[PDB]
Design a protein around this nucleic acid. Structure first.
Length: 75
RNA sequence: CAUC
C-alpha cells in the first residue's frame, strides 16, 4: 500500500478479462508492473485496459511486489 | 490477484 512512484506512464502488455489481471510495462524503467482489475478506475468491463494502450498510474508495494494503482488514461 |  506504500506508494513508490506516482504519475508513471506505461504501455499495457496484456490484460486478461477472464483472470482479471495483466501487466503494464513502465516507460521510464522498462519493467513490467502487475495490474489487477480493481486498480483500474471506472470507464460492461467497467474496469479494464486494452492491450497496447498507454496508461498513467501509481506504483505501490503490494503483497507480492510492485503493482499498479489508480490506473487511468494519460492525463 | 504475477507473465495468461
Amino acid at each position: 500500500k506504500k506508494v513508490i512512484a506516482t504519475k508513471v506512464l506505461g504501455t499495457v502488455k496484456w490484460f486478461n478479462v477472464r483472470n482479471g489481471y495483466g501487466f503494464i510495462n513502465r516507460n521510464d524503467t522498462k519493467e513490467d508492473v502487475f495490474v489487477h482489475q480493481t486498480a483500474i478506475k471506472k470507464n460492461k468491463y467497467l474496469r479494464s485496459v486494452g492491450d497496447g494502450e498507454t496508461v498513467e498510474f501509481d506504483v505501490v508495494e503490494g503483497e507480492k511486489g510492485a503493482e499498479a494503482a489508480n490506473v487511468t488514461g494519460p492525463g
